[PDB]
Ligand binder design. Structure first.
Ligand SMILES: Cc1ncc(COP(=O)(O)O)c(N)n1
Lengths: 206, 208, 209, 206
């Protein structure tokens, strides 16, 4: 099972954001304002490009995955609304300055979808989604008080998002099955890289 | 208004499918099961790739259009279920051999979305959606009795799809306004080429 | 050996253009001016886009192939001048209407290069180059007398072009050996489809009948 | 004239690398071997990808620009040999770890060629080439003694490279002329972005 494998050889990296400083704070609501606001504007920018990334994947996707991508893009597209509501909730501007670490991650994703194989691309989608599910699972299971950000915690840790993640995992495993060792390694490498980007992204807040 | 200039200039091509023989038979219920089947199999293929085309445009689209694309692709994807459900009811396979004209049209849209400007791609989208809205509207306006294919007639001629087309139209006209002659002429040419594809597609039903 | 496999399973289609009506006429010099002109205008369009197709592959290619693609694109781009020279000498225009079969072949290649795997793309490249190498080689070998289009016959049948084809073959075979059968089948399909396009392209010269 | 306009709105960014600390050390022969080696490994990676960037542009290029792209890609590909021989001589490995700012500049370029318009992409080509032409031309106009890296200084400050830049500039100016103010400003933004990337790349060496 490709998915299990990907997680193992990178458990080392994942262990670093499970939990990360930002999540510990989130859970114990020690987490400061200036920090959340920074994460918000940057992740908002990521989500927008993650939608372009998904749309590029859909264009190269097998016929039988088309319904999946259309539903998934529409589903992920709602996250935008969430970010723009919580921004009119905090009187904060999203059209602000974007951190370099974020553009780096965005551009890497776009390049993979554009020039990489479909496996590498779907592999990156699994990584990124499964990374937020776990990180946010941790925040949920380790929550103390009330977080003025419960909406975000409720979305990425929800059974619904977990089902979405499981659906991706199942598709990924089937794809990998019919692919050789060479192509798998390329995808393994993409997963490693996206794992690093996930870890680095959390530092943007500070 | 760019959308109207596009329509005016390709009027003689559009008049050819408004109505096309296939539409006359749909409206008079004289359509042979054999011809519908061929159109169904080939159009299903087209719909699948039209979604890929849209996904390609989405990735190159301006930030303010991302919501429109996510919604439109989700909306258009429902057509797949419509085709599949209708195929179960008729015991028809959608895995058949695809006509050269269909593959040609598909590969052209894909190339436009991949290598062309966003204006060219969005213009192709408008042409292809507006074309079906007009074609199926004609069918609903001339339908003699209720058709065994009413589901398709209703979907492409509905107020909902009409609003979708209008939404595309508004965006297209705004985009065109901030572009120059050179770029517009490229789009005009794409609109012309897609128009011929739309006209030629109707003939697939009578292939073989 | 993937390359030989590809050829073996499509030998029926290739036989149809080895030789095709157009090649027999080139070889016997029975080729009418009008037929050559139509082929010229359309192949010139194909070559331009074949360059774009190769550039798309280059962008997706492994580091160790960058030099090959740089050299090949430069080499193949020379063909443009070859078409342009010949067109000047014949007082013929290359700005005319392009045949539907040609656009269809071009658009398929660009779709494979953009949305397909690198393997499928490179397989399409091999097929297209290998097809022309064989066709023009047939022409050089059945040429009764010297042709007014010797330039084209020589370029595609030359030892230099054959080396270029052999170089693509060696790269392809080696790329295939590290892929599975699912992905190989995808490429097999592309090779078949490109083969049909090659066979059909020759008919363009007689279009407008 | 588009080119002049691009250079004038980013003039303050350009002055930071005209000269940058790296160029000053190159000119005064005070540059340390560790810093040159890092720049070499990282730029080699950039050159390989710049080639993929150029090929992507070629795929979208107007018919009358195909000759130019074929020649330019061939011309620029020679740089790989230049880097490879220097690395042979220094007993240095090119297969090392590449800085993130480099991969980021690379991925930004790939995204622009993939998803952007042809003008945006060609505006990026001009910026990147023109930036090295001026950077290396500065080093040359300020050289104290003949440098051990004189070969790099000469290739990018050469008449041949300058003619290559001028050829790009002329094509860019014609293109911009037939484009309406909207896609122009889009390209202006890209120029600004590549400018910033050119400036950051010089820091990699340290
Ligand atoms: C960081 C950087 N920016 C620009 C260039 C020049 O481009 P080229 O070697 O591709 O002509 C370069 N070599 N490195």
């Amino acid at each position: 099972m490709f998915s299990e494998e990907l997680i193992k050889e990178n458990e080392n990296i994942w262990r670093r954001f499970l939990p990360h400083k930002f999540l510990i704070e989130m859970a114990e609501n020690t987490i400061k304002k200036e920090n959340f606001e920074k994460w918000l504007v940057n992740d908002y920018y990521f989500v927008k490009n993650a939608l372009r990334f998904m749309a590029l994947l859909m264009a190269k996707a097998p016929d039988d995955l088309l319904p999946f991508f259309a539903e998934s893009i529409y589903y992920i597209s709602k996250e935008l609304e969430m970010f723009e509501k919580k921004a009119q909730e905090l009187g904060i501007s999203l059209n602000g300055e974007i951190d370099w670490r974020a553009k780096s991650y965005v551009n890497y994703l776009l390049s993979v979808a554009s020039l990489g194989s479909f496996l590498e691309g779907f592999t990156a989608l699994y990584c990124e989604e499964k990374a937020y599910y776990e990180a946010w699972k941790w925040v949920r299971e380790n929550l103390k008080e009330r977080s003025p950000y419960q909406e975000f915690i409720n979305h990425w840790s929800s059974q619904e998002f977990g089902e979405y993640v499981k659906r991706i995992e199942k598709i990924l495993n089937s794809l990998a099955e019919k692919h050789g060792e060479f192509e798998k390694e390329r995808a393994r490498e993409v997963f490693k890289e996206v794992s690093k980007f996930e870890l680095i992204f959390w530092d943007i807040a500070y």
